[PDB]
Amino acid sequence: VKFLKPGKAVILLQGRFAGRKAVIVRVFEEGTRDRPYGHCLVAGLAKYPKKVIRKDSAKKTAKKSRVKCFLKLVNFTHIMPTRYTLDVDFKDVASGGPDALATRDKKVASCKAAKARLEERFKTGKNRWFFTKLRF
Amino acid sequence: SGENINNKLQLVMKSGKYTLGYKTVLKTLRSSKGKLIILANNCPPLRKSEIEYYAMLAKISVHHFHGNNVDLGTACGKYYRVCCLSILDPGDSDIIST
Amino acid sequence: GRVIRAQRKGAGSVFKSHTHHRKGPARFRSLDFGERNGYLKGVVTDVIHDPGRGAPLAKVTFRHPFRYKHQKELFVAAEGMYTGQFVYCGRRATLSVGNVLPLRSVPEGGVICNVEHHVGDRGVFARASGDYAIVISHNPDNGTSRIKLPSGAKKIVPSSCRAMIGQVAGGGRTEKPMLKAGNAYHKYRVKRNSWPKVRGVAMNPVEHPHGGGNHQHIGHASTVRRDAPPGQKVGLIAARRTGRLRGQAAA
Amino acid sequence: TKRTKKAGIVGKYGTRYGASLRKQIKKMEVSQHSKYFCEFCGKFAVKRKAVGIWGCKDCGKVKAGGAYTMNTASAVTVRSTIRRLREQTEA
Amino acid sequence: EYKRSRLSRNRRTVNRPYGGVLSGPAVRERIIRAFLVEEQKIVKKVLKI
RNA sequence: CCGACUUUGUGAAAUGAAUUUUACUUAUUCCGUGGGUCGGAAGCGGGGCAUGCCCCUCCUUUUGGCUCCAAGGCCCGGUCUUACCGGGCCGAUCC
RNA sequence: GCUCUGAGGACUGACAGUCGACUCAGAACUGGUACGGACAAGGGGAAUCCGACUGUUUAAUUAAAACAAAGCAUUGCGAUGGUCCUCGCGGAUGCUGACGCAAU
RNA sequence: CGCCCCCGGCGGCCCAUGAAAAUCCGGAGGACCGAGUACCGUUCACGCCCGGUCGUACUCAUAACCGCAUCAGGUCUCCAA
RNA sequence: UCCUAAGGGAAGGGGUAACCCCGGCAGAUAGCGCGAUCACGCGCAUCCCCGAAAGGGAAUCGGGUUAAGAUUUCCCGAGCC
Numbered sequence: 004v005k006f007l008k009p010g011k012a013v014i015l016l017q018g019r020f021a022g023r024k025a026v027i028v029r030v031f032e033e034g035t036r037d038r039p040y041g042h043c044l045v046a047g048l049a050k051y052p053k054k055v056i057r058k059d060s061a062k063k064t065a066k067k068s069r070v071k072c073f074l075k076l077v078n079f080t081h082i083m084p085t086r087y088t089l090d091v092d093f094k095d096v097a098s099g100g101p102d103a104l105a106t107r108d109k110k111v112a113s114c115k116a117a118k119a120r121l122e123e124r125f126k127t128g129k130n131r132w133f134f135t136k137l138r139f
Numbered sequence: 140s141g142e143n144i145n146n147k148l149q150l151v152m153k154s155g156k157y158t159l160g161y162k163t164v165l166k167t168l169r170s171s172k173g174k175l176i177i178l179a180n181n182c183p184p185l186r187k188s189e190i191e192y193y194a195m196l197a198k199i200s201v202h203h204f205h206g207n208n209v210d211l212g213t214a215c216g217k218y219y220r221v222c223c224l225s226i227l228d229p230g231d232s233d234i235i236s237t
Numbered sequence: 238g239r240v241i242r243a244q245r246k247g248a249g250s251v252f253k254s255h256t257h258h259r260k261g262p263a264r265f266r267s268l269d270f271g272e273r274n275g276y277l278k279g280v281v282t283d284v285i286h287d288p289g290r291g292a293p294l295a296k297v298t299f300r301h302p303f304r305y306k307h308q309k310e311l312f313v314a315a316e317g318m319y320t321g322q323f324v325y326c327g328r329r330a331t332l333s334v335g336n337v338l339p340l341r342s343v344p345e346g347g348v349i350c351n352v353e354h355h356v357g358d359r360g361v362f363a364r365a366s367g368d369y370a371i372v373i374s375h376n377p378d379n380g381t382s383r384i385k386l387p388s389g390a391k392k393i394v395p396s397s398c399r400a401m402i403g404q405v406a407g408g409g410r411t412e413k414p415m416l417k418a419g420n421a422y423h424k425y426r427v428k429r430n431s432w433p434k435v436r437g438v439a440m441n442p443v444e445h446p447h448g449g450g451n452h453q454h455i456g457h458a459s460t461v462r463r464d465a466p467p468g469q470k471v472g473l474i475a476a477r478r479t480g481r482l483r484g485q486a487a488a
Numbered sequence: 489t490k491r492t493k494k495a496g497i498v499g500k501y502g503t504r505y506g507a508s509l510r511k512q513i514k515k516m517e518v519s520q521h522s523k524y525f526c527e528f529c530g531k532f533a534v535k536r537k538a539v540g541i542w543g544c545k546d547c548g549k550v551k552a553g554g555a556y557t558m559n560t561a562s563a564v565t566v567r568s569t570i571r572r573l574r575e576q577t578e579a
Numbered sequence: 580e581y582k583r584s585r586l587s588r589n590r591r592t593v594n595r596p597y598g599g600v601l602s603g604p605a606v607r608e609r610i611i612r613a614f615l616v617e618e619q620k621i622v623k624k625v626l627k628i
Numbered sequence: 629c630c631g632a633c634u635u636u637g638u639g640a641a642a643u644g645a646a647u648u649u650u651a652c653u654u655a656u657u658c659c660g661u662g663g664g665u666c667g668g669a670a671g672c673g674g675g676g677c678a679u680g681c682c683c684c685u686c687c688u689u690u691u692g693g694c695u696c697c698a699a700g701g702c703c704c705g706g707u708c709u710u711a712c713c714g715g716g717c718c719g720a721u722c723c
Numbered sequence: 724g725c726u727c728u729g730a731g732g733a734c735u736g737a738c739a740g741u742c743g744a745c746u747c748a749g750a751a752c753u754g755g756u757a758c759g760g761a762c763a764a765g766g767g768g769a770a771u772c773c774g775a776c777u778g779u780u781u782a783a784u785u786a787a788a789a790c791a792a793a794g795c796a797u798u799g800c801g802a803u804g805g806u807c808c809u810c811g812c813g814g815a816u817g818c819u820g821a822c823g824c825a826a827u
Numbered sequence: 828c829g830c831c832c833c834c835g836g837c838g839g840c841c842c843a844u845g846a847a848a849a850u851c852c853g854g855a856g857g858a859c860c861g862a863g864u865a866c867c868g869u870u871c872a873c874g875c876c877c878g879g880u881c882g883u884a885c886u887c888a889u890a891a892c893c894g895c896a897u898c899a900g901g902u903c904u905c906c907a908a
Numbered sequence: 909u910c911c912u913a914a915g916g917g918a919a920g921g922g923g924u925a926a927c928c929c930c931g932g933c934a935g936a937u938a939g940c941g942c943g944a945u946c947a948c949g950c951g952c953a954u955c956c957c958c959g960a961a962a963g964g965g966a967a968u969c970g971g972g973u974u975a976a977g978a979u980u981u982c983c984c985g986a987g988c989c
């Protein structure tokens with residue numbers, strides 16, 4: 004069975020985001036035109052949410068619960084994948100298409116929307132492992 | 140039956156498709172193209188446990204060889220050190236038949 | 238007469254130990270709650286050569302039980318420890334080479350090293366290169382134990398005393414002839430100024446009891462009493478016999 | 489060309505030190521310089537680094553062992569005795 | 580002459596986690612080891628039934 | 629080197645009309661720490677073949693990773709008076 | 724000494740072109756048989772005694788066969804300990820512990 | 828195959844493994860914090876001011892040092908056609 | 909000048925008839941520190957000083973110039989901490 008499919012959680016393993024967690028958005032299994040190695044687009048968390056506790060006020064909880072997302076094309080050798088999953092496939096059209104990432108303005112817009120939806124899923128309380136940072 | 144696995148693997152070497160080495164056994168796992176993994180006993184514990192992890196994810200069987208990495212190379216009838224193995228096509232043999 | 242070479246050593250002027258490149262004391266961990274009632278995992282980081290000592294020394298990095306920092310302890314190497322090994326310290330640590338256990342956890346016949354004598358004195362017996370002590374018996378009505386030491390001497394020790402499982406590394410070091418005044422000199426340079434040694438028979442009477450005479454000879458019995466005053470207790474101190482050992486005399 | 493009939497590694501000592509001392513230092517001359525097998529990486533690349541310390545060039549393990557040989561025959565007895573003695577009391 | 584007011588920061592650092600202190604091959608192995616052992620913690624808890 | 633007196637106190641037995649043996653801990657000596665878990669009793673599990681009532685354990689074996697400045701629950705009090713800071717216990721069994 | 728011959732290379736487009744500082748052999752001729760022409764630079768051998776060797780030593784009369792040495796052996800010592808210093812408290816060996824320290 | 832100096836990376840010897848600290852840098856963690864008629868940072872560039880005390884000549888030797896001396900003696904180094 | 913090496917002196921204490929002798933002997937230890945002062949909280953662990961003009965080390969190069977200073981001390985230019 005293949006375990007590198009969109010929606011699975013993956014820890015980036017090497018380079019300026021090693022140790023960050025992420026979710027595979029779409030997989031370029033059969034290489035590409037200019038990347039003959041196998042690779043796959045991934046969206047992760049550059050800045051994890053800080054711990055939320057009951058003691059702090061609502062403004063500080065909102066302060067502490069925000070995320071910073073990053074889009075990266077990663078070689079499979081550079082990602083060490085995991086069983087866990089993120090059920091948000093609603094970025095399929097958002098960050099999909101081999102066009103939504105070529106340009107900077109487009110990329111940053113995609114990251115803003117991905118921030119909004121990953122913050123919503125962090126609010127939901129599910130997928131706590133995806134938002135607790137790998138403590139290495 | 141260490142000799143009974145050694146002889147079967149010797150036959151897989153002549154008949155079936157097989158792949159040696161960590162960096163390519165991993166590629167077989169990500170392609171899911173492999174069907175069985177053989178691991179030398181002294182494969183470095185980090186490497187061994189991560190291959191075990193990918194095997195668990197890929198629902199693929201892992202067998203732990205009874206010798207060492209030099210012994211696995213000799214069993215595969217290769218002149219070098221081998222600590223990882225993947226059986227792509229079992230061929231005319233009985234390894235998966237366990 | 239004047240002060241003898243053997244008396245002169247008590248001042249330390251030129252007879253202190255050459256301790257500049259030594260890596261600190263080689264000893265166990267402080268005995269505490271964790272090491273008494275459970276086990277602690279330490280990772281061996283490097284096996285260093287300690288100048289002036291025959292055995293390698295294993296630096297081990299524990300985690301401090303009750304405050305947030307490491308602990309670089311430094312053990313005497315037991316033959317077999319390699320970097321990256323996890324050595325376990327405490328009572329309920331399993332019995333494997335490199336682990337340190339109390340003697341209440343080591344079965345009869347076990348070979349151990351770096352033994353404590355008073356529980357917590359941090360390991361004193363069986364430390365030289367290639368020496369071990371064999372744990373002989375246990376008395377649980379006293380909480381005591383018995384051990385055979387490298388000298389063959391048989392000692393009763395408290396049973397709560399720690400001991401490293403295995404034998405000290407570097408075994409058989411003294412098996413090699415040195416063949417050279419050079420090798421002897423480089424051996425003793427990093428230990429202390431106790432080499433070369435001049436035969437007292439080739440001295441003058443003013444500095445050694447054996448000296449003097451038209452010929453080179455001791456002159457009187459070479460064996461002196463246990464109670465001989467210092468500066469006369471020189472030779473074979475309180476010898477029980479002499480001559481080449483034969484038969485049971487060497488047992 | 490054969491360069492020593494019998495001397496070998498102790499040929500560097502020249503005509504000194506005596507036949508018996510040379511012939512009994514020869515074995516722990518060769519044994520401390522030979523390459524010993526590494527049980528962690530299977531290469532013949534463990535070589536002595538100090539008296540009692542044996543370092544591997546590839547995998548980075550350094551191992552505490554005998555002064556002039558990697559594994560003392562006494563130490564093999566010790567490890568076997570420990571193995572058995574752990575088994576019976578774990579039973 | 581590594582002092583902050585003598586070298587540029589890009590010339591003093593490496594932009595990764597543990598960079599400037601640990602090389603890539605070491606940090607990669609720490610990531611893998613930390614993940615795998617974290618996984619074994621909970622497989623061991625699940626074995627505790 | 630050994631003998632006696634001294635610091636040198638406690639109670640106990642056996643031999644003679646003092647002697648060796650012991651027991652206690654506070655004097656005393658020694659050892660170890662950054663005086664960091666000692667003593668008794670609870671409790672969590674495991675042995676039951678008088679359900680005893682006596683034993684064995686303290687939530688770390690694991691691959692050269694990381695662990696701090698508590699999360700959580702309950703009970704008061706101050707407050708906008710319709711919006712928020714300080715308290716106490718449990719977590720961390722008692723004596 | 725002089726005149727030669729041969730062998731050993733590099734770069735560029737089994738060959739061609741460009742360059743090359745050296746080393747090694749061989750020969751012909753020549754001289755008042757002189758040629759490591761100055762300088763520099765082992766006399767050799769047969770044995771005996773002593774110490775194995777290397778090394779160190781009486782500065783200012785003795786450099787040795789003397790001392791040391793590795794090798795061999797012996798003795799004390801398991802920490803409440805051995806050898807030793809200290810007027811005393813205390814200390815050296817000892818950042819040590821018998822494959823070690825200490826005394827021969 | 829030139830000499831001196833430095834560096835690189837191999838190899839070798841060790842019963843010999845061949846200093847410490849000041850100082851500097853990096854990282855692990857993230858308690859605490861902020862705007863968009865604007866306020867919080869910024870190891871960025873540029874800009875301004877100040878840099879105290881003491882030695883400083885000469886010999887370093889067959890004449891400046893010691894040997895009762897302007898003593899064939901003795902005294903540590905760098906450059907080297 | 910600053911930091912340590914071998915080592916040396918020392919506060920409390922121990923010794924001493926007293927000068928003087930011992931520094932780990934552990935003593936509310938010499939020193940407390942850092943964030944804050946619009947004050948307080950947290951930490952205190954092998955706890956002092958001295959010791960190198962050959963060890964470690966914030967930063968300088970070129971050209972001129974005097975009867976005698978400077979190569980980089982003065983002048984000229986350009987830098988650095």
Ligand SMILES: [Mg+2]
Nearest residue numbers: 430431432433
């Ligand atoms: Mg001497």
Ligand SMILES: [Mg+2]
Nearest residue numbers: 421432433434
């Ligand atoms: Mg001797």
Ligand SMILES: [Mg+2]
Nearest residue numbers: 434435436791
């Ligand atoms: Mg002698």
Ligand SMILES: [Mg+2]
Nearest residue numbers: 439440441449
């Ligand atoms: Mg004489």
Ligand SMILES: [Mg+2]
Nearest residue numbers: 238442445446
């Ligand atoms: Mg005399």
Ligand SMILES: [Mg+2]
Nearest residue numbers: 447448449450
């Ligand atoms: Mg005499």
Ligand SMILES: [Mg+2]
Nearest residue numbers: 589590592593
């Ligand atoms: Mg960089």
Ligand SMILES: [Mg+2]
Nearest residue numbers: 774775776788
């Ligand atoms: Mg001689």
Ligand SMILES: [Mg+2]
Nearest residue numbers: 781783784785
């Ligand atoms: Mg003379």
Ligand SMILES: [Mg+2]
Nearest residue numbers: 781784785786
């Ligand atoms: Mg003479």
Ligand SMILES: [Mg+2]
Nearest residue numbers: 802804805816
């Ligand atoms: Mg003593």
Ligand SMILES: [Mg+2]
Nearest residue numbers: 836837838839
């Ligand atoms: Mg080297």
Ligand SMILES: [Mg+2]
Nearest residue numbers: 883977978981
């Ligand atoms: Mg000047």
Ligand SMILES: [Mg+2]
Nearest residue numbers: 883884885977
């Ligand atoms: Mg001058």
Ligand SMILES: [Mg+2]
Nearest residue numbers: 892893894896
């Ligand atoms: Mg003069």
Ligand SMILES: [Mg+2]
Nearest residue numbers: 893894895896
């Ligand atoms: Mg004079």
